[PDB]
Amino acid sequence: SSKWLDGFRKWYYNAAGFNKLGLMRDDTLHETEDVKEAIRRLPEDLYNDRMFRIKRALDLTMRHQILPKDQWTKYEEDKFYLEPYLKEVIRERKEREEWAKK
Amino acid sequence: SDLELHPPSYPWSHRGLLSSLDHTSIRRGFQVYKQVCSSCHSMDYVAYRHLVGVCYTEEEAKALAEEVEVQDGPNDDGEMFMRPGKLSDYFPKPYPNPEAARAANNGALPPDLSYIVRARHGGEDYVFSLLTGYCEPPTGVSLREGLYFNPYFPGQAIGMAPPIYTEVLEYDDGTPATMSQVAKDVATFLRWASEPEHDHRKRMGLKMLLMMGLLLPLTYAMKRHKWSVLKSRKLAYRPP
Amino acid sequence: SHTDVKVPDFSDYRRAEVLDSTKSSKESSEAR
Amino acid sequence: MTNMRKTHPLFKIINHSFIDLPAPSNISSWWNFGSLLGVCLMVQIITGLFLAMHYTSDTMTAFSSVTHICRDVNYGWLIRYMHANGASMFFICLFLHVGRGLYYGSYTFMETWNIGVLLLFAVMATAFMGYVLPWGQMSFWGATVITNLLSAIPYIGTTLVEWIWGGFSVDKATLTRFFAFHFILPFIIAALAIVHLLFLHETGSNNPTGLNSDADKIPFHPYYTIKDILGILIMFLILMTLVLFFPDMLGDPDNYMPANPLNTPPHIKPEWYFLFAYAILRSIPNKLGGVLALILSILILALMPFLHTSKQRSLMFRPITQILYWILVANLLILTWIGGQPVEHPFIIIGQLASISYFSIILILMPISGIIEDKMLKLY
Amino acid sequence: SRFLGPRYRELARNWIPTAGMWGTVGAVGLVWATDWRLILDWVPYINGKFK
Amino acid sequence: EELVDPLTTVREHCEQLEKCVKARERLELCDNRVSSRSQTEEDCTEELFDFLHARDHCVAHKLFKNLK
Amino acid sequence: REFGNLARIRHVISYSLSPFEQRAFPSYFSKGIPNVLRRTRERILRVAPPFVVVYLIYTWGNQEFEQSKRKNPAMYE
Amino acid sequence: SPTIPSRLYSLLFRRTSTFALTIAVGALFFERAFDQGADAIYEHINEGKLWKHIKHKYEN
Numbered sequence A: 001s002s003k004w005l006d007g008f009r010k011w012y013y014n015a016a017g018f019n020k021l022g023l024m025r026d027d028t029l030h031e032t033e034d035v036k037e038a039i040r041r042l043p044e045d046l047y048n049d050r051m052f053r054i055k056r057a058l059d060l061t062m063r064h065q066i067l068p069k070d071q072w073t074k075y076e077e078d079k080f081y082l083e084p085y086l087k088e089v090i091r092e093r094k095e096r097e098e099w100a101k102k
Numbered sequence B: 001s002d003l004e005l006h007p008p009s010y011p012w013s014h015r016g017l018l019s020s021l022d023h024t025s026i027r028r029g030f031q032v033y034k035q036v037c038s039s040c041h042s043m044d045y046v047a048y049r050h051l052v053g054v055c056y057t058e059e060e061a062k063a064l065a066e067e068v069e070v071q072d073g074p075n076d077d078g079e080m081f082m083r084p085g086k087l088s089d090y091f092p093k094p095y096p097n098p099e100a101a102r103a104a105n106n107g108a109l110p111p112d113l114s115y116i117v118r119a120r121h122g123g124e125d126y127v128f129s130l131l132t133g134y135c136e137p138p139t140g141v142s143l144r145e146g147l148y149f150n151p152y153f154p155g156q157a158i159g160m161a162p163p164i165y166t167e168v169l170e171y172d173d174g175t176p177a178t179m180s181q182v183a184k185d186v187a188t189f190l191r192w193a194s195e196p197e198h199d200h201r202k203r204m205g206l207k208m209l210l211m212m213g214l215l216l217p218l219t220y221a222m223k224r225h226k227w228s229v230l231k232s233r234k235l236a237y238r239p240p
Numbered sequence C: 001s002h003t004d005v006k007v008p009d010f011s012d013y014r015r016a017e018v019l020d021s022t023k024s025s026k027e028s029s030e031a032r
Numbered sequence D: 001m002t003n004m005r006k007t008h009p010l011f012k013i014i015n016h017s018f019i020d021l022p023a024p025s026n027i028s029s030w031w032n033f034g035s036l037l038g039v040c041l042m043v044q045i046i047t048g049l050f051l052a053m054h055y056t057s058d059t060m061t062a063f064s065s066v067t068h069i070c071r072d073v074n075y076g077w078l079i080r081y082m083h084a085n086g087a088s089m090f091f092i093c094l095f096l097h098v099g100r101g102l103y104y105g106s107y108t109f110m111e112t113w114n115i116g117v118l119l120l121f122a123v124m125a126t127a128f129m130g131y132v133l134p135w136g137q138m139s140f141w142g143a144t145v146i147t148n149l150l151s152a153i154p155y156i157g158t159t160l161v162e163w164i165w166g167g168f169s170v171d172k173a174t175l176t177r178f179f180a181f182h183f184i185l186p187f188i189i190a191a192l193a194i195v196h197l198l199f200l201h202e203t204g205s206n207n208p209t210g211l212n213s214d215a216d217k218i219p220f221h222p223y224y225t226i227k228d229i230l231g232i233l234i235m236f237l238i239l240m241t242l243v244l245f246f247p248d249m250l251g252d253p254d255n256y257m258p259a260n261p262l263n264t265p266p267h268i269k270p271e272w273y274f275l276f277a278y279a280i281l282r283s284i285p286n287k288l289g290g291v292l293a294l295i296l297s298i299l300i301l302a303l304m305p306f307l308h309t310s311k312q313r314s315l316m317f318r319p320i321t322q323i324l325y326w327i328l329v330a331n332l333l334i335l336t337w338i339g340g341q342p343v344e345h346p347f348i349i350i351g352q353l354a355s356i357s358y359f360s361i362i363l364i365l366m367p368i369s370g371i372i373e374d375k376m377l378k379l380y
Numbered sequence E: 001s002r003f004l005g006p007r008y009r010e011l012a013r014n015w016i017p018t019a020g021m022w023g024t025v026g027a028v029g030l031v032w033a034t035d036w037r038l039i040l041d042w043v044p045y046i047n048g049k050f051k
Numbered sequence F: 001e002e003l004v005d006p007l008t009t010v011r012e013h014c015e016q017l018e019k020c021v022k023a024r025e026r027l028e029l030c031d032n033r034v035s036s037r038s039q040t041e042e043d044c045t046e047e048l049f050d051f052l053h054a055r056d057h058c059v060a061h062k063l064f065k066n067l068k
Numbered sequence G: 001r002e003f004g005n006l007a008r009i010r011h012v013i014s015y016s017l018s019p020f021e022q023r024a025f026p027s028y029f030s031k032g033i034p035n036v037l038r039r040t041r042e043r044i045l046r047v048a049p050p051f052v053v054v055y056l057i058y059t060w061g062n063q064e065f066e067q068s069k070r071k072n073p074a075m076y077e
Numbered sequence H: 001s002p003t004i005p006s007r008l009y010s011l012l013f014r015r016t017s018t019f020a021l022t023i024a025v026g027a028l029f030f031e032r033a034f035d036q037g038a039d040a041i042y043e044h045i046n047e048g049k050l051w052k053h054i055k056h057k058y059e060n
């Protein structure tokens, strides 16, 4: 059912390890051209939050430590902030590719 | 057969990481090589000048170099003459070419024992096991004459007669010249001939370990001192 | 405000000679 | 008054490349291996320069010249075993360099990765010809093995092996030209390393998290200066204990015999860093198939950046691909071992399954793992 | 599917003659540089030098 | 002949060690097996190698204190 | 590319102390051993079992090879 | 209350030139002292096995 899939996704979310550094999935997305377009399309507060989270993750990796378990981000609170911007950028790129093909 | 018998790990006096060779044992092994092994084997990369400084005095090395006659030349009219050897001369060939060695040794070629320890699996353990491992062949192993059964030799049919036994030579130190004593001495000598830089290399390694046990905590302390600015750095985020 | 900016406590990393806030410096700086 | 460090042209190039270089603040000890490779290259250049100062590339005098270096030249034994154990350390640092690049997603620097692959080929050729150089039994026989394996190519192989041999077998001309090539090729390696560093500095350096490291960057000096100095000291510790205590466990005893064309060795094997390629070439039972398998197994590193099917760069947050990568490293260890023992039972099936699993993991399994990993993280 | 389309198909169709002529250039240069017998023992003049 | 061999004293003591006793038992079993048959190609090199491995291992533990 | 214009960061404060005033090994063992144990705990399940099966098939291959070199008592009839 | 590192800094570790002089003199004296100590450790480990230990039997 969906409950077992959600539980196994929770276990994978704990096993991935970016929640221990305070990161998010959109924070740990690799920066391609479309991703960079999404970050440049981000608003100011979300940009500052993302860059501070990345800086704190880099500091923690430098010290070879993680955040306390209280300060780990949760799977329910992982905001998918870059998803609409990324989807719009992919849609525009696919439109451009279709126009170039036709 | 196709099997190999692994020589066992003998407790040599130089097997430790900071243990040198027994130079008296190298002396006795050189005497064993000169009086027994030199009739068939060659040691062309070792000289009396290599011998002096680790086993013999310069006068003793000169005496045992001049006790053998070497071929030299040419002279004024162009003729190969014979002169007593010197320190710079190497150990003399028992055969001029390897084909003569094969002819005089029933086809088998006695290898040069200047790198035999570094060139055989086991090294001095293999040499000791080969010299003290001669035994009667088991049932079903028919060996033609000129070959001797030796379990430690690959192929088990060596072309070597048993070279050493009890009272095969006389030592100048009064040491009993038993089979095991002679084999241990000649194995120590062959290890020295394979690695003349043995004790010097061990001294280098001892100095290197003392020096690096000094340097590594201190260099690590310098690295942690330079990196202490970052490893204790605190980050704060204050959006308005 | 910038006045709320306070340097956090560093006693978990700081040396023993300057661990006291009331004790002056420049008497252990040469030693360190 | 002017700032000489960033005003003088050579000084400002050095400052912009090595001194004031913005480096990621969180790169671990795995990032010391590039400088370890450079220091190993310099050590090899110096030690081989002295070895060639006392070395003659004649078939009659190669082995006697090596013995003369070991015994008669002052600390020539130290120079020679520093050279050999530095080759072992060079390949250790190369393998850990490539492992860092595969694990932390550094192959996305495509041109830097390709220059690195060309460097890996050049270093392998250099070390092969250098191992041929002392004219030992295993050196000569391994040279014959590798040249015949190259001669397996149809319609081109016989002419190419006669051209490289300088004759009909490994002989005087082969040894002398191998000495010339082994002398010259590390300088081509050094120039390609300048190209490597130039492309890397164009693209910037990569952090273990795989994120954008421009938020937190530190100058290279003095942080990574002292970190690389500590790494150099540790690498010298391992190299010097390898030279001064265990100088022959990574070498081969059969190389201490003169090269006899009439007598074969009991078991012919190449050096330990060629063993995985030797094992896969033994695994595929075709000469052309074996040499093509070797060539493709080294070119597949250049083929690697087109296999990235994940939206995460490094494997830090990719546990399934982490498991697959560690199985890949384990399989490389199995391949080195199988190149160790000869081609018998059950080494036939072990080497065959090791090669098939190695290729399957590096081609098929890792992108599928990345795809299902993205699906599990709900990316599409 | 980026390179699969009608505009790319007709661009490729324009570039077939040029790529084929470049391949002919490379083939002729390879035969001339290597002195390949299997090709050079069919042209009339160059047959003379091989005897 | 007058000077007894420390080598052979250690050898006979390692024969008195019981693992080598079992090895010699297999050796005599192989010897009678091969000898009580004609037209065979079986040799006793396997059992001899096992016995020699065990006995020379015992010797390598317990020989060089008797030498100079 | 240069050190002055790499990224845009706002409202972020960094605090650092002098290396001559803070220790180089601040409790090197007391919070050093638990950190190493935590790192090993996080990354021991993904690393160890591959080398475990290396050891297993290494031992199995050597045992099978030695059994192959061992003679088979089946030549009598 | 002036300690030994404090005197070392106030005398030798302050200026770079006298710092380098301290490094050079310490390098000379430590080279001699370390060579003597490591050599003595080597002799004590290998008593009765070296040529410098056994030459008195075979000389004069």
Ligand code: HEC
Pocket (backbone or CB within 6 Å): B032, B033, B036, B037, B038, B039, B040, B041, B105, B108, B109, B110, B111, B116, B127, B130, B131, B153, B154, B157, B158, B159, B160, B161, B163, B164, B186
């Ligand atoms: C003439 C009777 C010899 C005497 C005296 C010594 N050796 Fe010899 N040796 C001789 C021959 C004809 C051979 C070749 C046998 C063969 O089957 O190859 C050898 C060989 C060796 C070897 C090499 C064994 C190997 O596996 O390669 C060694 C290590 C060896 N011999 C040792 C050795 C020593 C130490 C001697 C002095 C006590 C000695 N041999 C004397 C011929 C003769």
Ligand code: HEM
Pocket (backbone or CB within 6 Å): D030, D031, D032, D033, D034, D035, D037, D038, D041, D094, D097, D098, D101, D106, D107, D109, D112, D113, D115, D116, D117, D119, D120, D123, D189, D193, D196, D197, D200, D204, D205, D206, D207, D301
């Ligand atoms: C003689 C050979 C080589 C030299 C001198 C060399 C040099 C370097 C140096 C100095 C660095 C920077 C330090 C570091 O990141 O470790 C580096 C990084 C890198 N090397 Fe190499 N390298 C060599 C071979 C290779 C090989 C064989 C590969 C891959 C197959 C490779 C690919 C890379 C990549 C991708 C990086 C970037 C890593 C990152 O950005 O984090 N190089 N190299």
Ligand code: HEM
Pocket (backbone or CB within 6 Å): D041, D044, D045, D046, D047, D048, D049, D051, D052, D055, D066, D080, D083, D084, D087, D090, D091, D123, D126, D127, D130, D131, D132, D133, D134, D182, D183, D186, D187, D255
């Ligand atoms: C300018 C650079 C170099 C020069 C001049 C040089 C020169 C030499 C010489 C003269 C020898 C013969 C000495 C001997 O056989 O021991 C040799 C051997 C060897 N070289 Fe180099 N070399 C250089 C760089 C390298 C590099 C970069 C590698 C490997 C990455 C390498 C690997 C080897 C090996 C493995 C041997 C065999 C040593 C042995 O078998 O004992 N060399 N080299």
